[PDB]
Amino acid sequence: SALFDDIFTVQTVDNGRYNKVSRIIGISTTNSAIKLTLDINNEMFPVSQDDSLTVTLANSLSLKSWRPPKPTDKSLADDYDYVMFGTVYKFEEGDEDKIKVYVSFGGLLMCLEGGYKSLASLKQDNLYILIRR
Amino acid sequence: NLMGKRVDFSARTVISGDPNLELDQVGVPISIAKTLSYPETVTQYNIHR
Amino acid sequence: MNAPDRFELFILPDDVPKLKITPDSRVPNCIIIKFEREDHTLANLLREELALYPDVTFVAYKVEHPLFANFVMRLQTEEGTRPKQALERACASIINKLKTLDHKFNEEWNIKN
Amino acid sequence: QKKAMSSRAGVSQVLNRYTYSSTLSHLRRTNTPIGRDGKLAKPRQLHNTHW
Amino acid sequence: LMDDDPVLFNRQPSLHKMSMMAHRVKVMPYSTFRLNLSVTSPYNADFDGDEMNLHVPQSEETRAELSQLCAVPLQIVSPQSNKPVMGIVQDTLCGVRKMTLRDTFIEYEQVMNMLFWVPSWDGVVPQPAILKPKPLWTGKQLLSIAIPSGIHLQRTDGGNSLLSPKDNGMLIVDGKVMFGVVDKKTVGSGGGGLIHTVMREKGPKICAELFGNIQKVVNYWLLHNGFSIGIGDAIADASTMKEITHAISSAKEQVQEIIYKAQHNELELKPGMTLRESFEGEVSRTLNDARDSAGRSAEMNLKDLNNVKQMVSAGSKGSFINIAQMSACVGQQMVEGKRIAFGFADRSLPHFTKDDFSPESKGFVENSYLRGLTPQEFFFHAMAGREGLIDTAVKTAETGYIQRRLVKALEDIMVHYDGTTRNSLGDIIQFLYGED
Amino acid sequence: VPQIGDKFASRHGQKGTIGVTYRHEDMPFSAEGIVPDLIINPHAIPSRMTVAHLIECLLSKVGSIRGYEGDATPFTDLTVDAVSNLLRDNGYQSRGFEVMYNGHTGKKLMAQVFFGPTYYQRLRHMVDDKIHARARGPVQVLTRQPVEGRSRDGGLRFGEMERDCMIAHGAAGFLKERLMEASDAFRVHVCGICGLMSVIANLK
Amino acid sequence: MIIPVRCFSCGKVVGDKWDAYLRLLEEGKQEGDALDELKLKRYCCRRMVLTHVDLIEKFLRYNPLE
Amino acid sequence: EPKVNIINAQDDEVELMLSDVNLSLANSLRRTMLAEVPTLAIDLVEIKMNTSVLADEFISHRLGLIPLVSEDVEEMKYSRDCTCEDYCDECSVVLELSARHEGEEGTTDVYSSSLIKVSGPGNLNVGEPVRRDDYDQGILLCKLRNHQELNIRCIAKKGIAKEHAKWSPCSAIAFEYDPHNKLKHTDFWFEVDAKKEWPDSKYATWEEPPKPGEVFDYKAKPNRFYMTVETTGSLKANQVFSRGIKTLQEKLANVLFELENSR
Amino acid sequence: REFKIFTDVGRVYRPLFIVEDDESKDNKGELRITKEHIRKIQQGYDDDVYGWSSLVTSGVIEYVDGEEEETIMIAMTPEDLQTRSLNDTAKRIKPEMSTSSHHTFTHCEIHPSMILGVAASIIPFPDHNQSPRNTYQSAMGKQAMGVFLTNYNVRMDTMANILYYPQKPLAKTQAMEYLKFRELP
Amino acid sequence: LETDGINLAEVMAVPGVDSSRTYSNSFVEILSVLGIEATRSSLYKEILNVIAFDGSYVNYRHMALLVDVMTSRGYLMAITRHGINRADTGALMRCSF
RNA sequence: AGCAAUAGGAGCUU
Numbered sequence A: 001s002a003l004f005d006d007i008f009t010v011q012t013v014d015n016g017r018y019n020k021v022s023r024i025i026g027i028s029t030t031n032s033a034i035k036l037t038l039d040i041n042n043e044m045f046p047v048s049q050d051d052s053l054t055v056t057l058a059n060s061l062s063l064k065s066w067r068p069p070k071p072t073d074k075s076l077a078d079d080y081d082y083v084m085f086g087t088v089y090k091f092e093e094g095d096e097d098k099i100k101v102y103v104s105f106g107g108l109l110m111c112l113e114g115g116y117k118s119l120a121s122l123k124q125d126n127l128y129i130l131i132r133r
Numbered sequence B: 001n002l003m004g005k006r007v008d009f010s011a012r013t014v015i016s017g018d019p020n021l022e023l024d025q026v027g028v029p030i031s032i033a034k035t036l037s038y039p040e041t042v043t044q045y046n047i048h049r
Numbered sequence C: 001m002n003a004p005d006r007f008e009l010f011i012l013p014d015d016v017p018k019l020k021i022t023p024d025s026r027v028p029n030c031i032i033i034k035f036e037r038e039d040h041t042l043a044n045l046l047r048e049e050l051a052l053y054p055d056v057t058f059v060a061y062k063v064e065h066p067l068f069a070n071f072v073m074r075l076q077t078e079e080g081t082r083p084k085q086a087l088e089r090a091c092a093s094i095i096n097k098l099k100t101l102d103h104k105f106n107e108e109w110n111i112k113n
Numbered sequence D: 001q002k003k004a005m006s007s008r009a010g011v012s013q014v015l016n017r018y019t020y021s022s023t024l025s026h027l028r029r030t031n032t033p034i035g036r037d038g039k040l041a042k043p044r045q046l047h048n049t050h051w
Numbered sequence E: 001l002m003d004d005d006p007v008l009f010n011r012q013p014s015l016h017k018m019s020m021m022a023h024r025v026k027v028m029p030y031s032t033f034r035l036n037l038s039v040t041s042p043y044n045a046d047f048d049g050d051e052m053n054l055h056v057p058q059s060e061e062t063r064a065e066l067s068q069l070c071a072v073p074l075q076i077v078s079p080q081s082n083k084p085v086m087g088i089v090q091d092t093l094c095g096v097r098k099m100t101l102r103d104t105f106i107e108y109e110q111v112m113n114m115l116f117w118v119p120s121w122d123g124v125v126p127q128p129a130i131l132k133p134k135p136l137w138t139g140k141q142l143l144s145i146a147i148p149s150g151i152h153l154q155r156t157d158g159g160n161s162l163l164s165p166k167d168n169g170m171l172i173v174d175g176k177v178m179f180g181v182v183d184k185k186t187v188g189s190g191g192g193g194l195i196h197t198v199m200r201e202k203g204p205k206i207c208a209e210l211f212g213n214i215q216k217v218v219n220y221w222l223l224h225n226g227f228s229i230g231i232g233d234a235i236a237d238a239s240t241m242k243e244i245t246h247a248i249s250s251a252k253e254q255v256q257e258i259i260y261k262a263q264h265n266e267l268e269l270k271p272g273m274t275l276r277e278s279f280e281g282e283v284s285r286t287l288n289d290a291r292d293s294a295g296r297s298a299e300m301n302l303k304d305l306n307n308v309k310q311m312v313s314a315g316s317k318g319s320f321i322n323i324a325q326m327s328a329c330v331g332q333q334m335v336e337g338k339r340i341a342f343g344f345a346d347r348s349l350p351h352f353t354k355d356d357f358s359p360e361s362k363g364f365v366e367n368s369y370l371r372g373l374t375p376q377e378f379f380f381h382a383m384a385g386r387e388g389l390i391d392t393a394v395k396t397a398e399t400g401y402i403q404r405r406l407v408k409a410l411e412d413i414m415v416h417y418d419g420t421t422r423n424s425l426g427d428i429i430q431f432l433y434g435e436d
Numbered sequence F: 001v002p003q004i005g006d007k008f009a010s011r012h013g014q015k016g017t018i019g020v021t022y023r024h025e026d027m028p029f030s031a032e033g034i035v036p037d038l039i040i041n042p043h044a045i046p047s048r049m050t051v052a053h054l055i056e057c058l059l060s061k062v063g064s065i066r067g068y069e070g071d072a073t074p075f076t077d078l079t080v081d082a083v084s085n086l087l088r089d090n091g092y093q094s095r096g097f098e099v100m101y102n103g104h105t106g107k108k109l110m111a112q113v114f115f116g117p118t119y120y121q122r123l124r125h126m127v128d129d130k131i132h133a134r135a136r137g138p139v140q141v142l143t144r145q146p147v148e149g150r151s152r153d154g155g156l157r158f159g160e161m162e163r164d165c166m167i168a169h170g171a172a173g174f175l176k177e178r179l180m181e182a183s184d185a186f187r188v189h190v191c192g193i194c195g196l197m198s199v200i201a202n203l204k
Numbered sequence G: 001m002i003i004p005v006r007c008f009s010c011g012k013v014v015g016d017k018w019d020a021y022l023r024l025l026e027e028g029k030q031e032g033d034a035l036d037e038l039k040l041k042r043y044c045c046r047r048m049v050l051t052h053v054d055l056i057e058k059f060l061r062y063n064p065l066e
Numbered sequence H: 001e002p003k004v005n006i007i008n009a010q011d012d013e014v015e016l017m018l019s020d021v022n023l024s025l026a027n028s029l030r031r032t033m034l035a036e037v038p039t040l041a042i043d044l045v046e047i048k049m050n051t052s053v054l055a056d057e058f059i060s061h062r063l064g065l066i067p068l069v070s071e072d073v074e075e076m077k078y079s080r081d082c083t084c085e086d087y088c089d090e091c092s093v094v095l096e097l098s099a100r101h102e103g104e105e106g107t108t109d110v111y112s113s114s115l116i117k118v119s120g121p122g123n124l125n126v127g128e129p130v131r132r133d134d135y136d137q138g139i140l141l142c143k144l145r146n147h148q149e150l151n152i153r154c155i156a157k158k159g160i161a162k163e164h165a166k167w168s169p170c171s172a173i174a175f176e177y178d179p180h181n182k183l184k185h186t187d188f189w190f191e192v193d194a195k196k197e198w199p200d201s202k203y204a205t206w207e208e209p210p211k212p213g214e215v216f217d218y219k220a221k222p223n224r225f226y227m228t229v230e231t232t233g234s235l236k237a238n239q240v241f242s243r244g245i246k247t248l249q250e251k252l253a254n255v256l257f258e259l260e261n262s263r
Numbered sequence I: 001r002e003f004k005i006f007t008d009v010g011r012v013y014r015p016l017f018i019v020e021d022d023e024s025k026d027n028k029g030e031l032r033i034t035k036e037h038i039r040k041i042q043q044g045y046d047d048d049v050y051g052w053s054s055l056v057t058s059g060v061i062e063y064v065d066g067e068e069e070e071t072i073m074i075a076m077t078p079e080d081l082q083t084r085s086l087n088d089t090a091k092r093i094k095p096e097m098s099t100s101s102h103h104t105f106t107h108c109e110i111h112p113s114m115i116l117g118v119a120a121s122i123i124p125f126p127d128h129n130q131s132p133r134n135t136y137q138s139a140m141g142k143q144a145m146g147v148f149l150t151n152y153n154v155r156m157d158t159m160a161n162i163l164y165y166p167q168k169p170l171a172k173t174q175a176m177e178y179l180k181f182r183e184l185p
Numbered sequence J: 001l002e003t004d005g006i007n008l009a010e011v012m013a014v015p016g017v018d019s020s021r022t023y024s025n026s027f028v029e030i031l032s033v034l035g036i037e038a039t040r041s042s043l044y045k046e047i048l049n050v051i052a053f054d055g056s057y058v059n060y061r062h063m064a065l066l067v068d069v070m071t072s073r074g075y076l077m078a079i080t081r082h083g084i085n086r087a088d089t090g091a092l093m094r095c096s097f
Numbered sequence K: 001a002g003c004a005a006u007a008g009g010a011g012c013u014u
Ligand SMILES: [Mg+2]
Pocket: E045, E046, E047, E048, E049, E050, K013
């Protein structure tokens, strides 16, 4: 029920500009040349260098007016630690097999490279990102 | 007296700022709102008022 | 010369109701309440009490102008529940909490002697 | 009195009693009767010798 | 006089057609007039004593004329420079800059209040940017709620990428902010910004309501966040003070070297310019660059939590020169284009020696306002401020005369139904208006 | 009694009028319960560069805490650092910032607020001495136009530049109505042959 | 003119402390210590008493005209 | 679940820690005690002969600002809900002040202790101007020289601080929570380090400082509130607190009543 | 090569300290006023009424008009009379004054704040403001409600405003002791 | 080249000068030498220079209208009483100015 | 159902 499952190894984390927000860069451990840049809330999901993150991209959390979740219901986000919602604002079907996707998580930005055969299904309107560890 | 002249039905007072007014709204003091007037012809849609 | 009276904050006229309820038709099972002659003291108390109930989906208030002593409150609830009953429930809960607080303060003050 | 024109105006003024410092300042005021007929900004300038 | 009556509202002097505009009435106590704060720019008004005039139309033709030609929403874009004249100002700008920072998050209850505060909210709670472990909204979402849908804006600031490491540039898709701090470059009165776009796409009414939506949301957020400024916001740390004073000392040495070169007759003149005027121009260049460099040091020292820096970065008040003069160096004072003249015999003040051309003698203020001016610097700065006040007082009469003569010269000129531009005699001034 | 629209100033060129008044419970408070008499806007300091205003607030706070009068004579060896040292020795944040709470919610403010005593002045310009409206009233004998003066119940001048602005707006009817029906409109009879106002008219 | 009854900022009653403050000042105690003993702890209350100027003494010197 | 822990308790002030309550509740209590607790204050002054140097409305303002004993003011009625014409005995308290200087040297001070209660809804213990001790001289009202006289008939009525500050039972309600900023509700301005440059709260030692190894908690809400109520002597501190609670209770009961009786 | 003596009426003048400038005694280069003069001023008499005029006639203060001011070298403060040997990042840098090898001062300011007038003397820390704001305060302070006179009750004027509860300022200038701003705030 | 002083006709003739591009900042000289349309162009250039000196931008049509009114009669009509009141318009307009 | 004019001076906001 997910669009892009993968495991990433965090390379650099520039806390830097902000206080609650850090930008991370990570290459997939199983399929290199897949790069991931992602802004994350430090206070909600602190991340250190060389850590290993299971990163999921999904078009839904199921298995239009936001209401707080009950304990009794279940969704895909129940198995993860950090879930964000975003808007795809650029799909770069560019060079030979460089495909860049741009997602805006309320101003927290993400970029995802890789071959076309990995990110072809990532051409949507809105995307969820889920993270473990 | 010809290029410019004094006119009736005018008012003047200090201005203040109001974050809660709309852009095309002006807040008018009650005393000025009662001193100034508008002539409204009586018709069959506004006679009760 | 244009200053209104300082007692119109609290003295209710005879032609002005204390409370007036209208429904918000845009979203289901929501109501708009205007409290006349009240201010942040009651509004914030009620808002933060109601915001912690599971069955309350939306609750908010505003004082559109500081020079007028009223506030308006939007409250939505789930399908089965009615926002009015939740409003009475919140009022009763705050009343009970204040009664317990008063009882404990009086006992503590007596013990301090 | 009959030569009010060609005579200096404003040589005497009503003492300002709005507040005490206003009175103290009015009693120490000075006026150069250059007049406003003329846009020479030079005599209006704070000058070194004013120190 | 009753609510929603159109009345003509006016402040003198009425320099352009947007100094007198028609407003809708709302009756209030407390004998002042009340204005929304975004219309204070076309009137050139503020709230420190000003008075404005109100004219009541006495017939239906004049009511309709006011409401359909002079109404405030219709004057947002001006023909003077084909750009908007009303913008977001003076606290909503600073607050929206703070609110649309990348690391600004809002909990559910404050989000709920801000949504209810929006007059045009459609009753749909936006999904939070973060869903786990705690629902958090970013300020960009709450500001995008204010913007109407169907608006697209894109701006690049110094070649930023679509991933915007600095959170610069601007991207708006269907009325939602993807990245970019919202500051003067987006909600100001400049051309091509958000206000101009909404005016051109949606009309004057929706553009007028945009001001109110943004003002209300940002004002609530700033009320519950807070914003202040103190004596500490003008203070730079010790290392920056060392850098600033070193730069000023280096510039003083440079000026002393220029003086030595001029006195031993080895300075290189410039075309159409005397040796003394060349010396003065070079010294003025050096001291202006000294002040600019010290200001740059002070600006780099300021943290992102510095309140002066936040106000400057938002563009709502102050600029880099203000920071420089408060924290680093007031710099050189000019009277009538030159440095401080030798009002005494061969000196500026009787505390100096004869023929002393050093920066301090001829009106260089080495201190900042925070540090305090010396009596000499105080007097020189007083001369400069007096020159400014005289200029403001004296040029306005020439300007008003010029504008009256221009109006009388051009008062009878109208575009006619055949496209031509003719005067009252019927004579052609242009065969097509604006040539387009 | 001071009200909305009265003009007040501090001793550093910082003039302003009252925009609104809040009661004791509505105003922001510090943890000691101190509330301000007056809340001015931060955007008046940077471009006006009235640093003396902030320095004088800090000195006044220290003087009121230690029970003496601060010396603010110009061109003395006093510094902001010494004042901040005194203030910190008195148990307050050395830069005059305080943690204040929102009066409406009691929640802390995310930003700290520059807080302390300052000497303000009550200027002679009161709104109640300026507010004037006129519907109809006395006219001049000679011109039959509204008289001049607030005290005389006069009217406001619709001068030449107001006419220019109305011309730019293209509001011809409004301009005619300002200059005729809101002012000295009259009726005269002319001779259809000679075009002079030498017509003797007996209307009854 | 005459000592205000309340503190402007917070409303503590200071009108019953002016005479005690003057008595404290006669025996040499400096202003801060006198304000401390009168239990004025907030600087608003302190500046209420510390900055009062008693002008009624000057007004009372002109003979009553009745 | 709500809890109270009194830390200091005397007649004029009470210092207490409030816990297990929402911040809105604590702030509503602070606001109610500041603004909506009824007291008694002079609301109508009648001058018979005032030949003092002070003006009539100056003296009237000062008399209105005089604290009066208001212990029993809750058994009294607002002067706008009584059938009576010009003040009766049950919705008002009438005071008299007579002062006079005889002789041609010295100044006679007119104090608030010179106010004399004449009528009032007995045997209710309302009306008297508040004295700190048995030997208190009260508030300074005016000063008198030779042959100058003051003859005043004051009326005292029931009111709240919303209408006018003279009805406020409280001076300053100190109020704070979370001395160590564990919730990160504030964001400290600093030059070098925010921990050195900011003084500790007076209740810092009442809570454990955060450990260096600790991570931020996003579940913690404010739960302990330290507040110090002070009074002007018109009401006692426990009375101010209890009647603020009761006034809030009756405001909520009024809302509930309107809701139920709107069906 | 001219010597001009003026005894005209209407010349504006101001007092200065007299620095001893005779180049023949160890008393050269410092102020002629000493601690005996201040002791006499506090005493109120000389040790075999001692006021300002006695200082003027003893040759320790003199008056100078604008023309005479052309020929003199005024030290700003009594410390400027001697070059100091500092490095205080807080106190303002007193100007270097390095071009001139040896200063020969003839006068010293009594106090530099005396250049201001009556209205500008109310301003606290006027050297931390941009000059237009000082000018606006100089204009606006004359419109400030206070107590113009203590006999306002036996006077009959067209208009009068009296503040109910005037307060002296918490931050005060030395000049206001002479302007009575603390006596009639 | 830039110069002080003005002699347009003789400098335009000097060999080595681009005779088709010499320009003067005195548009009365332009009118005497180059005609009225070149005078209009020069007038617009001067007005644009004066306004845009400080970074101000006035839309083209306003300055175009101002220079077209000043060159409509074939000669330069100054914005003064000596220019405005020498027109053929009605007496009441001219007197009102 | 009816409240002078002309001057000078000081100020307010640009
Ligand atoms: Mg203004």
